[PDB]
């Protein structure tokens, strides 16, 4: 099965590289995501037994859409749908799972949608390590996450270069 030997490669290539500060590859379903709109993407690191999906929770308001994703204990618990900004109970309108949609359509995307699995001890590496969803790029790319990223420098340890 390549399952084997696909997951050895790839799950690999994902951990070394990244062991040069390439900061060319991401973990986890949004960063893997967004990278792979980002169109920075290689290759995908997606696992088959992979127990992340997307729902989309949405309210007649249509003034706070939300769509993320959530682990078995994450929908039973079912407080991330509200918000105390909103204080409204979201309306699932679909569900669809994320590893099944990371195969439908990951050539849109331009990446490679691979599947591996934690049998190898590469794959612990990105369970364990992350989750079992990753997202190889082709270069360094512009991260964004907490607000004032162009500048502060949130995760651009070129800030030090700046000072010298």
């Given at each position: 099965?390549?399952?084997?030997?696909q997951?050895?490669?790839?799950?690999?290539?994902?951990f070394?590289?990244?062991?040069?500060?390439?900061g060319?590859?991401?973990?986890?379903?949004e960063?893997?995501?967004?990278?792979?709109?980002?169109?920075?993407?290689?290759?995908?690191?997606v696992?088959?037994n992979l127990?992340?999906?997307?729902?989309?929770?949405?309210?007649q308001g249509?003034e706070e859409?939300?769509?993320?994703?959530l682990?078995?204990?994450?929908e039973?618990?079912?407080s991330?749908f509200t918000?105390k900004?909103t204080?409204?109970?979201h309306e699932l309108?679909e569900?669809?799972?994320?590893?099944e949609?990371?195969?439908?359509?990951?050539k849109?995307f331009?990446?490679?949608?691979?599947?591996?699995?934690?049998k190898?001890?590469?794959?612990?590496?990105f369970?364990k390590g992350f989750?079992?969803?990753?997202g190889?790029?082709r270069?360094?790319?512009?991260f964004?996450?907490?607000?004032?990223q162009?500048?502060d420098?949130?995760f651009?340890d070129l800030d030090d270069?700046?000072?010298?």
């Amino acid at each position: 099965n390549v399952k084997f030997i696909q997951e050895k490669k790839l799950i690999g290539r994902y951990f070394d590289e990244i062991s040069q500060d390439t900061g060319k590859y991401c973990f986890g379903v949004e960063d893997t995501l967004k990278a792979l709109e980002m169109g920075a993407v290689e290759i995908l690191i997606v696992y088959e037994n992979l127990d992340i999906m997307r729902y989309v929770l949405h309210c007649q308001g249509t003034e706070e859409e939300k769509i993320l994703y959530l682990t078995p204990e994450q929908e039973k618990d079912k407080s991330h749908f509200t918000d105390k900004e909103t204080g409204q109970e979201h309306e699932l309108i679909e569900s669809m799972p994320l590893l099944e949609w990371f195969a439908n359509n990951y050539k849109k995307f331009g990446a490679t949608l691979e599947i591996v699995t934690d049998k190898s001890q590469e794959g612990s590496q990105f369970v364990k390590g992350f989750g079992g969803i990753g997202g190889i790029l082709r270069y360094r790319v512009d991260f964004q996450g907490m607000e004032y990223q162009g500048g502060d420098d949130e995760f651009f340890d070129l800030d030090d270069y700046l000072e010298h």
